[PDB]
Design the sequence.
């Protein structure tokens, strides 16, 4: 468990806002996308396993990591669609090519599965873990954090996230089996040290989760892309977690139904990269070698 970020930070302005990203190596792209409340930092111990297998790209979502904050910020900002507009523009700017392997977690999986479904001819394979794969009910959601996420999805969410930073301070470490070092935790806290709107992305994201049919637009998006995943012969690598968090139970059964997929299981809850980076990295490398090595 290295504490240092991978690679050098780079920035490009997208719609007048700086977006930060890692871009190392050469060849066909391997694109790692984080979710909430993380950044490219999440992949620092995984990316080294793919050196020499492609061009390794990991972007920080708008409002997250080293990327700029939107202003004026408020409850109408950092929706799925807004996040998608920024990210997909950054990916276009980076000229990723047409043999992309996506490596996806959490909201990074909704964004990446959506991108792949819109660019089917440019995606070579998808590796995913603890991903958003189907509309949910609360029965699918980890029991220990049902009240907290229902809380986020109410007016209580503003104090919880913007004042108390509960996503970063409580949800993130609660969903890692090991204890992070102070140094690692400081990297996850850095984008969100200031109280108030700086923390808005951490609150907007849970409000987009497709749970009991709301928000309908996200439910519809996920139904669309999963309808493709269910039938496509695109190669897939499912990294299961034990105990896991959002892919457990019937959702885990469902993902296992998808075609042209292999899996592994690693120890972890939600932020599996922080419990099992060597096993994850090794599996993705083996996947990519099978797809590419000759
Ligand atoms: Cl979330």
Sequence:
């Amino acid at each position: 468990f290295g504490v240092e970020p991978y690679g050098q930070p780079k920035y490009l302005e997208i719609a007048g806002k700086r977006m930060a990203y890692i871009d190392e190596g050469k060849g066909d792209a391997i694109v790692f996308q984080h979710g909430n409340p993380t950044s490219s930092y999440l992949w620092r111990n995984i990316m080294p396993h793919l050196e020499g297998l492609g061009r390794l790209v990991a972007c920080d979502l708008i409002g997250m990591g080293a990327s700029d904050k939107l202003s004026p910020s408020g409850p109408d900002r950092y929706s799925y669609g807004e996040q998608r507009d920024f990210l997909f523009a950054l990916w276009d700017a980076l000229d990723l090519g047409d043999h992309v392997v996506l490596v996806l977690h959490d909201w990074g999986s909704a964004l990446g599965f959506d991108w792949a479904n819109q660019h089917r001819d440019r995606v070579q394979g998808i590796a995913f873990m603890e991903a958003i794969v189907t509309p949910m009910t609360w029965a699918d959601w980890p029991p220990a954090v049902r009240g907290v996420f229902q809380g986020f999805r109410s007016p209580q969410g503003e104090p919880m996230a913007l004042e108390h930073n509960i996503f970063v301070e409580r949800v993130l470490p609660g969903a890692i089996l090991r204890q992070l070092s102070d140094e690692e935790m400081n990297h996850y806290r850095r984008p969100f040290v200031n109280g108030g709107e700086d923390r808005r992305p951490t609150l907007s994201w849970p409000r987009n989760l497709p749970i009991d049919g709301e928000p309908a637009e996200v439910v519809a998006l996920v139904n669309e892309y999963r309808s493709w995943l269910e039938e496509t012969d695109m190669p897939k690598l499912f990294i299961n977690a034990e105990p896991g968090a959002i892919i457990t139970g019937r959702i885990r059964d469902y993902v296992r139904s998808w075609p042209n997929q292999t899996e592994i299981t690693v120890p972890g809850v939600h932020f599996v990269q922080e419990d099992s980076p060597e096993e994850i990295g090794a599996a993705i490398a083996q996947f990519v070698r099978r797809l590419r090595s000759a």
Observations:
- Residues 36, 205-206, 209 surround chloride ion (CB under 6 Å).
